[PDB]
From Swiss-Prot:
Keywords from the named record: ATP-binding, Cell membrane, Cytoplasm, Glycoprotein, Membrane, Nucleotide-binding, Phosphoprotein, Repeat, Translocase, Transmembrane, Transmembrane helix, Transport
Enzyme Commission identifier(s): 7.6.2.2, 7.6.2.1
Listed name of the protein: ATP-dependent translocase ABCB1
One protein family per Pfam: ABC_membrane
Activity regulation note: Translocase activity is inhibited by verapamil and is sensitive to energy depletion. C1orf115 regulates drug efflux through modulation of ABCB1 localization and activity.
Source species of the chain: Mus musculus (Mouse)
Length: 1177
């Protein structure tokens, strides 16, 4: 329906809308009512009040009185203008404030419930829809709903009230003439309706394009590190630019439709005027009407017609809001099958850990032609440990996901204590299960707050106990702020092992009955793995654990071990029995602040399209000056009309004025369309350019910039969209009409001046008082613009953090907590909106009241002028019309002050991002680019401290050397700085002391893009894009077009080609967001292929085999050994099997080197390396 919105009105918002509509009706009819009650000079309101001479014999006494009686009438009308002005003050304040309050409350509820619809969806829903658009929706569509259900509805109702009041006055003075002119009401209405429907469709398409553009920006900014490492800034900007172009085209179409609607309305009105004079000239010839009769009905219908003509932007805003309310309410109305918010379902008192998987058949929703499990059967007894082993992609993580009811199996049963889990309450089932995922993800908050996400009502003592069990106490105590040290998005400001241990503690603070641990020790060293294993063993008896580990040391002591082959368990049993059977387990085990000109400079960025601007200015001047010139030309029109010579022939011969009104309608159509279309196209080009430049500037910035807690994905994505939209809100047709109004005021100045100069001083006085309300509102609103921008950045941060990490939120049952945080983040903008409602209501009220007071003052001063014979009554009526139009112009400019307020704050910020220069500039062409590279990498006394934690020494005089054909093995404990070396070699940061040399040349002198071009890195937690497999390997070289054969060769070297070939759609298969749609090993192998397709001279691996099986690791090692010569390789490994083949191994701890040499040399001495290899054995 059209009215899907206003669903969350409630009684208070209904009462606001009803009383505001009543106030709008009263305010609209109050001007018709004045002329209805008082009509003796309403006939005079037809200018050139015909006196029919009578001045030949004016007694100067008969003349005298006449002027005194006329003065008395003007004074009475001035008093009534003052009274109507006070009434207008009250009713206009009510009309604006009530509608704004209702819109604000409804928008607050809409945002809250749209957030409580994304959190309610299933994981399968998230695996099919592009959820990277959703935040843009929350930032944009709702805002466009806010712009179409507030003040605009009241304004439209006021215009309608003026329309009906004017037509009621005509009916009183001429039923037939009014009925014929009213014949354009249905055609005008249908025109408005069709244009509104087209506007709604175009708005829906444009918002879809903007949502797609926001999704690219969400993916790229969340993966800026991969984007910078592989130099994909140009490609990621082209991807953004494509959706920017689509949105610009749709917006240009929107501008065309809206302005042709405006022009068509004005053309219809002017054609109706010509029809009115036609039929009235008939009524006069046939003698059934007088001239006064046709003039009055005209003045009465004209005001309402022009009010409706001016009401078109309100209809456009309503159409845009209804177009924006499509996807939001579509997502809201969607009801999941697995409802985590449902209260139904059994919550058994005594959950004994009896887990059964019976004939489990499952296929993922995104890839539903692939069978992952084919009659999986597995029984886990209370207090027992099952260890799931097998090849990568077999379905172990799928089984873990099915245990926590992330999906429902197509066939089979998952049961606890013999009870089917689809009948258990979803939330209750999930709280009794604690899960550590294959690649743990933290949240952008403190360590303690991250732990509290496992269980909200947790004390500091139990947090300490859990982090001691997780072997996390030591490093948390070591860095300052203790538990209050905030980590980055997804835990990026911690080492991989630290993040994994934090996740372990977060799962442990739940005291779960079912502990799922999927590769929970992949980022840990031998000591941390051993101590965490012992801590878990000390608590096994009370709970049941399902553990999946590619490190076969942990599964040695498991009570039962189950092997996956072909989607089923082929061998289940203990270690000794499986070794006796010599099955797949045996095979696995053997193979071992605000400048005020900011808007001016943003518009100066729009200088290329100056011809559009000049055409729009000319059109705005034409229509704005024709608005008051209407009174003058009708004065001349009235002149001849009233003049009667021959009775019938010449009166009908005066059809030239119907032609004049037709020409005026054509000119109005052309000028309104031109002005609006040119300004809207200029605004579309400007907003697209601003988004392009801001996104390019963000991709230019350093890694340290992205590590700033204020610069989070959600914050950045909100900042970009919000600044572009806020600047756009003060440009386009909104700007165009402003120029028109200036022209109007200018014309009002000249028409008065050529007709009477005494009344011009009244305009010169009343402009300041009608603009003081605007400037004081511009002030009040300017500071809360900054405040609301800062709060909306945090709201977007919370929303994006919840969306990008929805699986973690669902596993932790933290959807309600994130909803509470989102609601809290909305409170300050909500209260600011509620107070802005009253501020805008008072501003509009004061403006209209001073307009009416200006009319009263005009009538009184004109009475003085007429009494002293200084000026005539025809002149005081023409100029009074000029004063009315000038007051309108000043009032509308003052109403533009809120739009410009947001624009200037946003401009001062768009200008700054754009002019910001990073220290390590990746766009700079400067820098020495060596013609040859020999692969000699040296670190000399490198000292580095991370910008977000500058007081913690990370590397202290680190020195190392690696040459071509040599393999450097970085080993050591978690947090020692192994990944920091790789990040420094990529020049993500610059060390304060020491140097990094490439072939004897210090790396800060080399070109940054050139230096990164010869680096091929596999990261510790590899990130892929939601793009094809082939597109992901090809990101390994963005400079050239990578061929299909090269991609296939890289995949074969990465031992991933067979999976891609077997999978339907092959290399065109989309992986999901950050490799969600592939197993950890498959994702890591695709990352390896991405790094290898580049054929780098320097290959940096950061635990590149953590998620790989023994066979896959062997294949990758053989592939690397085949190409061992011809490049230099630096490997970070927690597995001694890969390390023992390295040419040289260095043990780095606390940023220093302790032991270095070959495997035999390190083994000879009983040092750290010997201790590690002995504890492993
Ligand atoms: C052309 C544009 C510029 C103005 C359109 C004016 C009317 C067509 C609209 C404006 C406000 C609307 C009203 C705003 C709110 C409501 C409450 C709404 O209530 C619900 O939808 C309740 C649903 C629920 O409780 O679940 C019913 C329609 C109604 C009366 C709407 C009827 C149609 C109205 C008068
Ligand atoms: C009682 C006197 C004083 C005024 C009478 C006015 C009517 C003759 C006019 C006013 C508004 C007009 C309506 C305004 C808009 C539309 C929608 C229009 O269809 C569309 O453009 C879209 C249809 C849709 O979206 O469903 C069809 C004509 C209609 C009903 C119009 C029919 C004629 C109406 C009722
Ligand atoms: C007719 C003349 C005499 C003017 C009458 C003015 C009233 C109609 C105004 C003035 C103060 C207004 C109130 C000022 C502030 C608020 C709080 C506001 O609360 C919110 O929705 C935000 C806070 C929250 O709920 O978190 C709701 C509207 C309300 C009651 C306003 C309702 C309309 C009021 C009573
Ligand atoms: C909307 C407002 C703030 C803009 C400016 C308003 C003035 C231009 C209005 C406000 C009150 C008006 C005055 C109200 C009453 C009088 C007294 C009146 O005095 C006489 O008749 C004097 C006769 C004599 O002694 O000769 C002359 C007009 C005047 C000054 C009016 C002139 C126009 C005034 C100054
Ligand atoms: C920035 C703020 C302070 C502006 C406030 C404006 C109002 C205080 C002014 C604007 C127009 C004024 C009115 C303009 C003209 C008249 C007619 C005037 O008539 C006479 O003086 C009649 C004398 C006679 O003939 O006996 C009486 C004051 C009055 C109502 C004025 C009352 C004060 C008003 C409402
Ligand atoms: S009807 C031709 C012309 N009026 C307009 O163009 C017009 C657009 S919007 C509008 N008038 C609003 C609804 N009018 C007023 O606010 C208003 C208050 S007093 C007044 N207009 C005086 C009586 N108008 C004129 O003298 C006049 C002559 S032509 C004209 N308006
Ligand atoms: N969300 C998903 N959508 C579609 N397919 C998926 C999804 N998640 C996993 N898959 C696919 O299901 C299969 C099994 O994946 P799963 O994560 O269960 O394997 P695994 O045994 O845990 O692997 P690994 O040892 O690499 O961690 C793979 O082919 C994988 O690509
Ligand atoms: N972006 C960052 N901001 C601040 N501190 C960081 C950041 N990244 C890492 N650190 C810190 O720097 C230290 C070294 O981390 P690093 O990632 O280099 O270790 P590592 O040897 O690779 O660890 P692991 O074996 O756990 O992967 C740790 O104390 C870590 O918390
Ligand atoms: Mg897995
Ligand atoms: Mg690391």
């Amino acid at each position: 329906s059209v009215l899907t919105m206003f669903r969350y009105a409630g009684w208070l918002d209904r009462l606001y809308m009803l009383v505001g509509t009543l106030a709008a009706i009263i305010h609209g009819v109050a001007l018709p009512l004045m002329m209805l009650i008082f009509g003796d000079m309403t006939d005079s309101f037809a200018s050139v009040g015909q006196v029919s001479k009578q001045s030949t014999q004016m007694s100067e006494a008969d003349k005298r009185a006449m002027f005194a009686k006329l003065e008395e009438e003007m004074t009475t009308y001035a008093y009534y203008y003052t009274g109507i002005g006070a009434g207008v003050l009250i009713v206009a304040y009510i009309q604006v404030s009530f509608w704004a309050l209702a819109a604000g409350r409804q928008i607050h509820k809409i945002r809250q419930k749209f957030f409580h619809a994304i959190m309610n969806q299933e994981i399968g829903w998230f695996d099919v829809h592009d959820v990277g658009e959703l935040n843009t929706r929350l930032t944009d569509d709702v805002s466009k709903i806010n712009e179409g259900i507030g003040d605009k509805i009241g304004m439209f109702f006021q215009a309608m009230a003026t329309f009906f009041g004017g037509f009621i006055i005509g009916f009183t003075r001429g039923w037939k003439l009014t009925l014929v002119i009213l014949a354009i009401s249905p055609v005008l209405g249908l025109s408005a309706g069709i244009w509104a429907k087209i506007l709604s469709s175009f708005t829906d398409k444009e918002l879809h394009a903007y949502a797609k553009a926001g999704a690219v920006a969400e993916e790229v900014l969340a993966a800026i590190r991969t984007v910078i490492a592989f130099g994909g800034q140009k490609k990621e900007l082209e991807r953004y630019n494509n959706n920017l172009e689509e949105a610009k085209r749709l917006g240009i179409k929107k501008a065309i439709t809206a302005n042709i609607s405006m022009g068509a309305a004005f053309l219809l009105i002017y054609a109706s005027y010509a029809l009115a004079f036609w039929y009235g000239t008939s009524l006069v010839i046939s003698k059934e009407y007088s001239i006064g009769q046709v003039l009055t009905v005209f003045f009465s219908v004209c005001i309402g017609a022009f009010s409706v003509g001016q009401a078109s932007p309100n209809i456009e805003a309503f159409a845009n809001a209804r177009g924006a309310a499509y996807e939001v309410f579509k997502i809201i109305d969607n009801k999941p099958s697995i409802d985590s918010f449902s209260k139904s379902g059994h919550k058994p008192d005594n959950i004994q850990g009896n887990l059964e998987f019976k004939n489990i058949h499952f296929s993922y929703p995104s890839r539903k032609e692939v069978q992952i499990l084919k009659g999986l059967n597995l029984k886990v007894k209370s207090g027992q440990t099952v260890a799931l082993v097998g090849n990568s992609g077999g379905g172990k993580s799928t089984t873990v996901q099915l245990m926590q009811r992330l999906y429902d199996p197509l066939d089979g049963m998952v049961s606890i204590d013999g009870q089917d889990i689809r009948t258990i309450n979803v939330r209750y089932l999930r709280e009794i299960i604690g899960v550590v995922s294959q690649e743990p993800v933290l949240f952008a908050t403190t360590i303690a707050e991250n732990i509290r996400y496992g269980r909200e009502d947790v004390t500091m003592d139990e947090i300490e106990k859990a982090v001691k069990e997780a072997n996390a106490y030591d490093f948390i105590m070591k860095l300052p702020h203790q538990f209050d040290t905030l980590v980055g998005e997804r835990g990026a400001q911690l080492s991989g092992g630290q993040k994994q241990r934090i996740a372990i503690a977060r799962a442990l603070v739940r005291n779960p009955k079912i502990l799922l641990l999927d590769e929970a020790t992949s980022a840990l060293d031998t000591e941390s793995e051993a101590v965490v294993q012992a801590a878990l063993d000390k608590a096994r008896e009370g709970r049941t654990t399902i553990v999946i580990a590619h490190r076969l040391s942990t599964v040695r002591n498991a009570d039962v071990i189950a092997g996956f082959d072909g989607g089923v368990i082929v061998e289940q049993g203990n270690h000794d029995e499986l070794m006796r059977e010599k099955g797949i387990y045996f095979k696995l085990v053997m193979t071992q602040d605000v400048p005020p000109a900011s808007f001016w400079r943003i518009l100066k960025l729009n200088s290329t399209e100056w011809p559009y601007f000049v055409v729009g200015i000319f059109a705005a001047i034409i229509n704005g000056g024709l608005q008051p010139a209407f009174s003058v030309i009708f004065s001349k029109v009235v002149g001849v009309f009233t003049n009667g010579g021959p009775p019938e022939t010449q009166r009908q011969n005066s059809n030239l004025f119907s032609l004049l009104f037709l020409i005026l309608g054509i000119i109005s159509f052309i000028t309104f369309f031109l002005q609006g279309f040119t300004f809207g196209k200029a605004g579309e080009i400007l907003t697209k350019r601003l988004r392009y430049m801001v996104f390019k500037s963000m991709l230019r910035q350093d890694v340290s910039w992205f590590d700033d807690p204020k610069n989070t994905t959600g914050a950045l994505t909100t900042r970009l969209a919000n600044d572009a939209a806020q600047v756009k809100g003060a440009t386009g047709s909104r700007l165009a009409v402003i120029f028109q109004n200036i022209a109007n005021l200018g014309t009002g100045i000249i028409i008065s001046l050529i007709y009477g100069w005494q009344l011009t001083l009244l305009l010169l006085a009343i402009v300041p008082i009608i603009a003081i309300a605007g400037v004081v509102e511009m002030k009040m609103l300017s500071g809360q613009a900054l405040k609301d921008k800062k709060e909306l950045e945090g709201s977007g941060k919370i929303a994006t953090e919840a969306i990008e990490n929805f699986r973690t939120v669902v596993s932790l049952t933290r959807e309600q907590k994130f909803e509470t945080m989102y609601a809290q983040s909305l409170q300050i903008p909500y209260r600011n909106a509620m107070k802005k409602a009253h501020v805008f209501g008072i501003t509009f009220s004061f403006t209209q009241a001073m307009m009416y007071f200006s009319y009263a003052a005009a009538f009184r001063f004109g009475a003085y002028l007429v009494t002293q014979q200084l000026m005539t009554f025809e002149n005081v009526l023409l100029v009074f019309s000029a004063i009315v139009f000038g007051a309108m112009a000043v009032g509308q400019v003052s109403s533009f002050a809120p739009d410009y307020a947001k624009a200037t704050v946003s401009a001062s910020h768009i200008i700054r991002i754009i002019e910001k220069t990073p220290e390590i500039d990746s766009y700079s062409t400067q820098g020495l680019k060596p013609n040859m590279l020999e692969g000699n990498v040296q670190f000399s006394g490198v000292v580095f401290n991370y910008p977000t934690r500058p007081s913690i020494p990370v590397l202290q005089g680190l020195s190392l050397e690696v040459k071509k054909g040599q393999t450097l093995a970085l080993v050591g404990s978690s947090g020692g700085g192994k990944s920091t070396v790789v990040q420094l070699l990529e020049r993500f940061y610059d060390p304060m002391a020491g140097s990094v040399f490439l072939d004897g040349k210090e790396i800060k002198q080399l070109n940054v893009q050139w230096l990164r071009a010869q680096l091929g890195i596999v990261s510790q937690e590899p990130i892929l894009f939601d793009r094809s497999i082939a597109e992901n390997i090809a990101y390994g070289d963005n400079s050239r077009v990578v061929s299909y054969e090269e991609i296939v060769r890289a995949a074969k070297e990465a031992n991933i080609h067979q999976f891609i070939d077997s999978l339907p759609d092959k290399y065109n298969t989309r992986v999901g967001d950050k490799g969600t749609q592939l197993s950890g090993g498959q994702k890591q192998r695709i990352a390896i292929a991405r790094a290898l397709v580049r054929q780098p001279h320097i290959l940096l691996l950061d635990e590149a085999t953590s998620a790989l099986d023994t066979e896959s690791e062997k294949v990758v090692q053989e592939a690397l050994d085949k190409a061992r010569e011809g490049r230099t390789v630096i490997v970070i490994a927690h597995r001694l099997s890969t390390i023992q083949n390295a040419d040289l191994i260095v043990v780095i701890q606390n940023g220093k080197v302790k032991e270095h040499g070959t495997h035999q040399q390190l083994l000879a001495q009983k040092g750290i390396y010997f201790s590690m290899v002995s504890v492993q054995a």
